[model samples]
Target: PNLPPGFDFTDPAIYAERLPVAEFAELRSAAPIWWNGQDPGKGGGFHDGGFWAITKLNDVKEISRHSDVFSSYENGVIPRFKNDIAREDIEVQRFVMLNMDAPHHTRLRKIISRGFTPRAVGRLHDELQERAQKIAAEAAAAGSGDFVEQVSCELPLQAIAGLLGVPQEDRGKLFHWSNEMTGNEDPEYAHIDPKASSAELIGYAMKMAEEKIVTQLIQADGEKLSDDEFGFFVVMLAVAGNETTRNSITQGMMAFAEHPDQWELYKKVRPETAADEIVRWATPVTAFQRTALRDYELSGVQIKKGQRVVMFYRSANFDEEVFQDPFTFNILRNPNPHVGFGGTGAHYCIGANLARMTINLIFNAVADHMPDLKPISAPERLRSGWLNGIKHWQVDYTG
Candidate 1:
């Protein structure tokens, strides 16, 4: 079996420390489908860490293009969790379309696609923009607030709950449950204390699903939702919708903060426009994992069946082969086909448009209204090895 030197998929800290450009770039050449042997550190190592790490762009694209040999549902999409966490999570978390394979994924995505399609999301553009402004107003009033919690995290949850027609009071609960569920990397957000378990949050999501079923039952138009449809919507929105977007906003803003001039450029010149430059540089999530289903060879290495591999989209976004001087930020970049959202495949993120709209709207709102968006404190990175996010950010604004 082929293995890369010093690569460990199971150690979040190893990933946390080394997954930035320098190391990831080295792996692109040395061992594209590299294997990481098991370790017995940080809670406990994973048996599955002894798997492949797909590093090259073409191989990743090809693997994504053909999902049959790289199925998602065969062993759950992500690498098995550290220990009992995985077992309990599997028991509690419902199989959203993201976790399903083939026909089931396609069918479920279709049913849900109506709500998430570009056109449907576009209809709510004005409302989302307004909410973005409202959030800016709150942030401005505070002068300096936790960027993720107060603004970034809140706006998207509100937008999703509005779309689902969920009760306003319940929105906060949904948001909290989501961060607890998917946010295991950040010590601040993840359940580090003995207060509640990840499994408890999963149960909370199930309860939200149950509540949605009841709420859908008494809808003004009974014909609106299909059977158990709203329940799935609530669960998806509560978990995926809330955490993902907020992380993007919070993390995206921090990316811009590093290049304050870019923030100025957007605010001064293209106050209303959005381009890939703003997003590609942000790289909210670092990578998405893909497990090889059958034996495959790429970059002169054999990727055996059932080996876990990941495509680092952030690295691709900054690939010297693709982007010129990819490290620098520019707002005028058009056709910036960064894989921040996802790549071509059976599992391409369906909510991509919604995510883009939210980012664009939020940027415009912040740029035009707050003219003085400055960092007050350093940002806190997400705890996840799979996605990049600012768990906490404090910024001062004046406009």
Candidate 2:
């Protein structure tokens, strides 16, 4: 394959660490849509082993818009997992909609989208805020602990589980399930399960869905439900939410710690800034593959049917052309049109508003309670290419 120049297909660590912003200072100035060929020695998996990288903000937007030319369903979501367990995915298509394109994508999304609307999402804010406060309080009481696990993990899942009506006790099941299911690409997870993780979680979801169907929690008609109905609805809600937000919150915190100046900004200013920055900073969904429906050219890059191209939200959030002093972290960046959540398109994340709420709730608690904290030990980064998350982070805070 004729690959583009100045891109790396191997070295997951570079993307994992996600620093040294200067390395690709010319990312936009030079080749914006550059191909990164695979390393056969590294054992190509998803992403067609190697792929064309989209570095510029403009180019990423263009690529997302022309999904017809760059197919998501055929090529796969994360290039690293393209063929790893694709057969199993075919067997369990009901729970994973991030890999689907429109019509099917739109249809499934409609049913799932109901529980994640701004109104539904807004309902989680107070509870998330409370959970954040409790996590911070624990860290404050312990005075020392793993930052990500102590704060990040508990906060998001508690909120997700609460919304889904899953007993707090069973929340751990969702956590372990989400972790194993999403960590396939991580080198550390070489021994992780192929289907058991998702299997249990999906089993839980289906069982709950069945319970909801019988109880009339989610029905052919969307209407008010009884307390039991609402309780079952909570289970459905949690299954739809969770996961990505968990990764984003934890990984976003890890990314912020890498830049002390940004950390200071987050501590001093409103934590909402930290929420925005991290989402833009370490983008959980590095790149979402889109299948092109028609022949088109994007940002001067040629496209054809059935070709898989990834819209790198991580790259777009950091584009020099779009952001002023793109590398610097400013909490007050108001008009920030970061693609960290989703950008101009029909496939934008349905849980975006809820995600912001969850991020904001946690950020506020950290900023208010532990402003002077910094990591004492380096983070243990998750061992996957698809999800950007931290396995653990140790921090030292002073009162």
Candidate 3:
């Protein structure tokens, strides 16, 4: 496996602290559609085969939108590395909308859209703003605290829990399960057996679905989701809605702290673009794998049917060809075509609007109320390649 210089995408350690942004830049310039060779044997039990890394912005968008050529169903959503658990039993790939294709993905997405339409989520705007302000105030009052835990991690869990009809008291359990399920690649949460984590998540979702079905809580259609389908729905929401948003918030704070000029720009100039800028910079969900459905030529590179293609959203978001001053964080960046929300077209994140709302409201609150805040200590990064996550971050506000 002759990997390019500084291009070991399989190694989780490379992403343990900071994403290898320089390395990605190097590869993006030299080989935008570079092959990462065969699996390096340690990609969170989900990197089983070779994959062509798609680094260019246009190429990523093209592959993402052309689902007919790049199928999500064939190889599941993520590459499989080495896992004892059978592929057939991976509930996410088997049932979740993330891994579905064609009419099935279209049908379920339509049904699910009933809950996340702009109008439906807009109803929560006032409540979300109130909660965001309260959380920021609490963190500021503490004077010094772990921002990730105290502020960034709290709001999205509440929002998603509420959206899923989960009770306030049960949110702790929901958060724990969500972390364990997605943070498996990080050693902090990896000690828990992956098989057990999956089973527990499914069981919990099954119980919730059972209760919801019994009470007729979900009325999208008379056709009820099977236990597995409902379970995937629950897990997907917990992982996608909760985990990713949390990381984006945490990373946004870090970005602001590191670039006070950008923070000032956020506060003084274009606060409206704050959410898009931060989401583009953070890129919480790193890479998602797509399987080539047939022979295709993408950006002058030949891709064969059955080959795995991994879209590095983190890389694409920073492509110099698309973004001016690719590494600089400017809140007022217009024409920002970041694939952080899982690209454009059908597979775009269903909760993009909600996520932007959450990030925007919370960031504004922090900027308005705790403008003097700065990172007091280094962040503890998550040891995972899939998720651009920070496990802990401490900060202090001027007295």
Candidate 4:
């Protein structure tokens, strides 16, 4: 009933209130593909036409699968900004591996991804498991206060740092740099310049290029990452990988605490499906923007070339066509085709294995170290439609 007419799904206000799940359900039933803005001219005055808002799972899947037809790099994966300078600012985003499409995207991924493969990541299992235990134990022992700062934030930052073979002492540096980079919109983080942080991040990356993982990748690949690429690589890795996993974990806690039945199920079985359900339920990286390379019909919706296409992964994750009970938190839902990780495509999340491993281990550790876990306060939600993030939440837990 609340599906507002011509509602711009990208508008952050909707997210500030919460995921427009009801609105999306309305869209799923009414229109699978809806134009976000009216008019090819899009209301004149140097206007750029708005993107297509894809709501259904099949449509999202179709668009994501055809990377050649719907390009990630053509217009940069994010929607165009009205601010000219702001548009230019995120131009660096195009160079990111997240925004790149195949040939180069395919090749570069093959090169850097050797370190993140199942076998490579599997080797670090015992080490990561131990880290997860310590993280959970420390948080559980405290028995109160911020779950995010203590558990969610610490787990991914430490996990990524450990991946880079970063010393325990330097983990805080990574945390600080990540804050500086991501806090671009916040007034409080205004003093810490993002460029300086990137510069320092790159500088540190160069120094650590000789480390175990970095050196091994550098040694194996003749297709080495140039200094600038390496800079963006690490920046993108730390921020994107960290935020996504961290949010998933934070959301995981909130979900379990909300659905105590699911928690009982989780403790009973330690289901292999738990992590994906968390991701599906959380849908951390909400929507991704894409550009149509040529005029094409998506289902029944017609699109012109160069027009933007925004696929709402979160919306599609709840599509009734895919899931029996889309609203319920069910970890046992196998064959869960939730596009929480940007769908199945060349641009699908590269750190997927790493994310899965991290999520699984953390949940296991939480289960083992903190048998009685419960959130004691409401969550402070992140202010972005594009990211389903819980910035802060307090919890009480006992071992």
| Predicted structure with the largest lDDT when compared to the true one | 3
Q: Write the per-residue lDDT of candidate 3 for residues 277-390, one digit (tens) a residue.
A: 889999988888898889999989999988889889989999988999978888888988889998787788999999998898888888778988988889888776677888
lDDT of 4 by residue, 1-399 (tens): 356675767665566558887777787888778777844432211136576788988888888998988987766665432222344556666777877888878877877786687777787788989989998889877888788888888777766777767787877887788766653232323366777787798788767664436666566445777655666678888767888899999998888988988888897789999999999999988887888889999887888898878898888999988898888899898789889987787777877888999999999888888878877778887755476777788788862
lDDT of 4: 0.77
lDDT of 3: 0.78
Q: Over all chains combined, what TM-score does candidate 3 have?
A: 0.91
RMSD after CA superposition, every candidate = 4.2, 4.5, 2.7, 3.0
The clash count of every prediction, one per candidate, is 3, 23, 8, 0
Ranking under lDDT, best-scoring first? 3, 4, 1, 2
> On TM-score, who's better, 1 or 4?
4
Task: Score candidate 2 by TM-score against the native.
Answer: 0.83
lDDT of 1 at 181: 54
Off by over 4 Å in 2: 1-7, 10-13, 16-23, 39-43, 46-49, 82-95, 213-217, 222-243, 250-274
Model 1 residue-pair collision total: 3
RMSD from true fold, candidate 1:
4.2
The CA lDDT at 375 in model 1 is 82
Q: How big is the positional error of residue 222 in model 2, measured in Å on the Cα after superposition?
A: 9.7
Q: Which scores better on lDDT, 1 or 2? A: 1
Instruction: Please give the lDDT score at residue 116 for candidate 3.
Output: 84
Against the reference, the lDDT scores of all candidates come to 0.63, 0.62, 0.78, 0.77
- TM-scores of the candidates are 0.84, 0.83, 0.91, 0.91
Off by over 4 Å in 3: 1-7, 39-49, 80-92, 194-198, 212-217, 220-228
